[PDB]
Amino acid sequence: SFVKETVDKLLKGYDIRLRPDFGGPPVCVGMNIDIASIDMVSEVNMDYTLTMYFQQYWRDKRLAYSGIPLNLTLDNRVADQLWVPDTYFLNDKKSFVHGVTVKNRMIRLHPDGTVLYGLRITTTAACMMDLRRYPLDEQNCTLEIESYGYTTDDIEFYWRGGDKAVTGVERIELPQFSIVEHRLVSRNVVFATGAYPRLSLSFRLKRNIGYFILQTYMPSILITILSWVSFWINYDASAARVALGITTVLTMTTINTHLRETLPKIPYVKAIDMYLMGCFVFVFLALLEYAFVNYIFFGRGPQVNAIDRWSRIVFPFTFSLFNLVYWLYYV
Amino acid sequence: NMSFVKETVDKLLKGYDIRLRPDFGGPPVCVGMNIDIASIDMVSEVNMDYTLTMYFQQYWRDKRLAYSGIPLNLTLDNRVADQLWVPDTYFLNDKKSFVHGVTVKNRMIRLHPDGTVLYGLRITTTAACMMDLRRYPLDEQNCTLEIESYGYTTDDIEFYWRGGDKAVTGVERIELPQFSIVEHRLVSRNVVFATGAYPRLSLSFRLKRNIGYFILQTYMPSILITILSWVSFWINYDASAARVALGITTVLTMTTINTHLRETLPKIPYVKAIDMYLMGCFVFVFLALLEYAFVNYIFFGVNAIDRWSRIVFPFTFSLFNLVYWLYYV
Amino acid sequence: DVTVILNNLLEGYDNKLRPDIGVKPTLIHTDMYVNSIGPVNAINMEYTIDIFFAQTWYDRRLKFNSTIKVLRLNSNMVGKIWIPDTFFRNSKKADAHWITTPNRMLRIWNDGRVLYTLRLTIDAECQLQLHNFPMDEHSCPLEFSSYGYPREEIVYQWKRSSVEVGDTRSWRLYQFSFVGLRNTTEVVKTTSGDYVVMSVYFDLSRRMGYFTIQTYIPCTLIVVLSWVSFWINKDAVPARTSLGITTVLTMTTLSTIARKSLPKVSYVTAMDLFVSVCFIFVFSALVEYGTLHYFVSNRRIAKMDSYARIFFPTAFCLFNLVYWVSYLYL
């Protein structure tokens, strides 16, 4: 009864078209985010999807009420009758507000005129990724928050709570990644026309190497080692050394094509392509060594063991040096 | 001047009832339709449909919208379409369609002084096309687009192609990934029922599939493998390791080709010409290996059987190719 | 008659204010009828569920004195009265149904009790721990609460027929079997306040028949097949070498299927452990032959095949015993 009178008085004459303190100091808008989850980190599309509770705080003297000590939580449709900041995400590609069972939005008023405006948003934000070190790569994905049509002479952004404004990051579980840290940046994009407020939330994601050791590196290493067995096979066993070499070459090709089919399509050279190509070269040279031995013994016979004995040392040594260079260069 | 146009439009919209068709109590209103095709894309064999984007124009006469004193054609804002009567035109085989709305809803309303109304829409529609792929990839397809009135018979509305055979443009400028538009046709007809006749327009194409990729990736490698399987007939019968390894490796290669073409090509769960050809080559290499097994059993459990096979296998395979390519071409 | 009653009820009714605002929390009784639990998408770590969600509360402002006991209405009056802002906290995506009409029901009794039911399809989030895959068990939750009203304003409470299910066979579970259901209630503290959260947990256990037929048996057969070289004469160098390397190639081919329907988790699952161990076994059989051939020809040792015929089956049976005990029972 009395609350209905107070709310109707507040909404009577309210002009949504005018920001609070239209001709005075800029309205200070504080923002805090609760990250519910992060998923669909796509290297192909160079983006990621996150669901969050985006809460804004600001003061509007026109909405101050007296005589009620309670904090009035109103129906979300009252948001259509109030002024709200034109906050948008610069790198967002496709975002929506959940609407089940009703629109996921809250408006809470306080007796001093403070307005709390909460939204539940699932947004897909573009993240430029450098994958030359894939899978041993570290990514930095951001979320840019900005005002579309207001300068710093009218609105200002700050993180409400300082470094604790963003919460829930430590509870995020990514199957392929681990969140090393997150940072909050509050800066003004100074232009000739004027400064524009900007808030930046950034995560540093580190890819987990455990999957590729079991699926990519160990099979390639074991096949490369098996290709060296022909060096201990007697040179007369042509049908055995040839079969072993060409079957290991086929096995390496099969592994390479399987990885090309199951890994994301990233059409430029990565550390995994260099490693797979190196193993393919090693098995190619292992078979070439026997071809040279056979030609030397048979082709230039009428016109041998030292090459094999030399290769029993050079091939493991060169392959170990290649691994040492690879693992030091990319770590 | 401008205020005169404003008052003319107000007079035209004063008393206009969108619930009544033009010439409500008289002859049916003739609606002329023409389509400008922008592009055709995503011709899906699995879903049996194709997606096209077009400029769909409709002309009709409404005497209620006749104005005098302005020698210009009044192209008005697209939202005036919500204030007029437009035909209830729908696409019968449409599965999912929408009108583009960037930066605004892509529609137009142009009024002429005599009352002729031009109502244009930019529509991207996915239309169903039931395809007979028994001759795939040596097949032709006929995909149509049906235009019908939802709630009006031929007594109330009539359809015709404005411009006749020139109604549809842009067909020759389309470039599909794996097809080639041969010809298109326009059909105007009435669907006769007991209640009455319903107007219908039909735009149809004839798609011819390109064969170069299938020749290079399906037929030629299978032919080379089949020819390679014949090498076993020119090796001595006592070279058991060489002939057995060649036979079973050619069988493995044919299996690899069949299974990878199975995964690569669209999932069409019935027998096609490509499957018959791959199965025929698989049978030929199976029989080539079984021939050696028979020779080895005869000798141990012999140059005549090898001399006979060196001729019969190339001859039978060539006859199979001749029958195959005569059947599907 | 009824039109007058409806007009009187809607007259002087503000839907911006919850019932009993400033007096006591609005008690809401919730019921759920699971029509079907859709497929579990392990790749995206989510699952689909279709429910009929019912809510019942008291609004004293809607009392009417008449011979009619209950007003049974359609979705027309939904926008006219106050409705709780219930939302599903772990929902990645949720949609109501509109064909052919908004699938909603509103019933108002004369004493002010309001029943509001609607049909929902929810893509809830479920964090799957796949360390025991394919012998894994999960309890996928489903949490909902009021978005804006804290515990001092809206309190939820399960009705007696809290959660109801129909034909479990009609459900779309291909990989899992429904094996139980629980419901809880708690208070979650957030920045905006303290909220009453009701949870429903659906227990799922994976069925291992397909993985047994497709991976475990072919891998075991290939390992046994690689043991054939130990019974082949050591003079048949091409035979034992080609058998060893083709078995390695076949095991490599099978290792492709190991990670097919599951996300790229970076911990060793039971399936990965089994495939990798079988791959090491077939690798070691060929290395064993390479060593025997080197020592016998190129340069106890001569009896290496005799000990390998015993050690390899014994070590493999020990491995299978440890694997299937640590996973099936322990």
Place this chain on the structure above:
Amino acid sequence: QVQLQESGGGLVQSLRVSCAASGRTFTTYIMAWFRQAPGKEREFLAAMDQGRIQYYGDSVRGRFTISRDYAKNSVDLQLDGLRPEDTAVYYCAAGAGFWGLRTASSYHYWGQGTQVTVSS
């Protein structure tokens, strides 16, 4: 062999010049007309891409008309209000418009050329 045969032209005191394309379908290629004055340079005149968008040079804007016969695979040029300045060699070009559709270096298939002489 892909060729761009150019017809028409000659001694002219309205002139239509055609350009037949053989050996390759130019449905999805940009077909243009270029003018080369004697010894000066090659000058862009007109062009038309797949979408029927017509581009014209400043000196021939509103004077020359370009039309493409996608069925016959040919491009025609309509010259009106001819001047002695237009007496030069006219070429027919077709290309992907890489690095600008007005630069001559962006076109690969070139016709043998046609000589137009204007006497008053």
Place this chain on the structure above:
Amino acid sequence: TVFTRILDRLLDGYDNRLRPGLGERVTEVKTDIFVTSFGPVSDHDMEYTIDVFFRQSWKDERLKFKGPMTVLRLNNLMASKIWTPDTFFHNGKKSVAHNMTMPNKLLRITEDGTLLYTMRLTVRAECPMHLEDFPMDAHACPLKFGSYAYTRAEVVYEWTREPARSVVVAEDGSRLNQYDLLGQTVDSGIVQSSTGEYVVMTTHFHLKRKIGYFVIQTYLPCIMTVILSQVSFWLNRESVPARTVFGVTTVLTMTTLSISARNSLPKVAYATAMDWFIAVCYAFVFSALIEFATVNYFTKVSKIDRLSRIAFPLLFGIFNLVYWATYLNR
């Protein structure tokens, strides 16, 4: 003139929140369905698409009128101000009401007060499947619909004609590549829920899969591979490398066929008839090489070979006879 007046007077004092005959009788709705095209069936999602012309006819005495006109066609905006049945599909997932280029709805009113409501819909509906007999399986995909908020005491549903003739399918309205539409069964019943008893109208479409594709693509290559594996029994026991390469390359061929074969089948966790068939072929190819390992272990025409040249083909023939008589008699 008079047409406009009647249209203006029709909605005078009309309350669309109340069903016709409220408190007097039971609203009787006559429905019929014209299936323009039975859309594709998704085995992975266990759903089928269908495009229909849904027709509903009922009587509302509040809409009687007199005039020269006999049938009144209503604008969709006007048709949205009139009470319509809240019919919804119980097993529908996500249905689309086409809105191109205008809403595909039509409302006709007769002078008697009878209303005919026709709409065009694309209905995606759940079709539970048991693929234990795949690919020799048959399914009955249901389509159930009824009222949401009205029990049988208020709104009932009937078919306009006899149930066989109340659902009509076009001659070429079949968009099925792998199935055959044997026929439809039309019925109705009562479903009791926690809120009341509702009339349900059901239609079951019977589908049978086409086995020819799997015979050419899967069964024949597996049978021929098995025959090739059994062919090695006729090679002389001294050619160890030849019979060894034959055995392991046939094992690799079977592995390749099993892998590509499980890609086509949707990912189910239970064993289908094809999984068992491939598993048995795998066992036969494995046993052929174990047989050669045993023959080679006693070499210094083998009776073991003579026995296996008969026992293996006989066992495989018996297995095929059992498998086919088991599943074709379903």
Place this chain on the structure above:
Amino acid sequence: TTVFTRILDRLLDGYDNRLRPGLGERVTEVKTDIFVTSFGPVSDHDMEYTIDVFFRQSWKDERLKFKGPMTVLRLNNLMASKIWTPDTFFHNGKKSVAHNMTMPNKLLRITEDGTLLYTMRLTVRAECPMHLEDFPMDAHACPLKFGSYAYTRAEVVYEWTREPARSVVVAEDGSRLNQYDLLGQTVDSGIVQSSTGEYVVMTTHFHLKRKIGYFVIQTYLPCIMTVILSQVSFWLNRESVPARTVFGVTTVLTMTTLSISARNSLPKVAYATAMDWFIAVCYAFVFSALIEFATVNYFTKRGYAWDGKSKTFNSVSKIDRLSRIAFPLLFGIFNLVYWATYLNR
């Protein structure tokens, strides 16, 4: 304060949004410029690309001249929907999104003299037809055509705000391409003719060149190594019939696997690309190397090879001697012709 509200209410009294400014009096000139925040991914399979832009349109409407203390009026999007705005659409756009999170990303500004500025943030997905005959050494000019949908050349004309080169501005970090290299963009305007009349079209072409290194490492190098491996068998002794037979068939299987994988990395087109011909030639070479071995073996008289302690032994086949030179020569000539053919365009 209250003067602001008064001016806002007074502006729309008598205004008719259904009529373009200067209807029947002059041509409505629209000045446009585009700021590309990110040139998004290019999809070869769909033959389309995504672009995120800030679209700016400016024009003069004398009906909206106002006098007051403020010189610039900023309009709410609701009020902006009551004012006539150009119906600009993208001719090759496929499915574009006008972002409205958390509020409509639009901005309408009015100067005192009646000049309106209309800035909006858009995500445009436009079709880019491609000629993949030179794959993976192809270059494309993906277009972006926009203009008026309903107003002909005699009513509304579009122009670039500044010099056309400087009118379209791409951000320094705009490129989001994994497989292409954005070399630049050309900006131009033209005239189109439809069944409804002549229209002005503003076109921007973005020039993309595909990166070749990935296909060199994944496809070209393994194929070359496989062909060299197949030709290596010519150096084995002719008496090793099983060894050279297994070598030949396993090289054929390796080539088949590489061909299949290389085709799976190419968008589904039915015409022959440059890599298709390269793989087909490598397949032909491995096939010929095995037919060559079948011919060598057909003339091998004796089944025993020469021994170190050295009976008559077979001499080295003249076919093998010829093939050890011809096959590397023919393959090198093919490589030179292929690369000079495609890398010189």
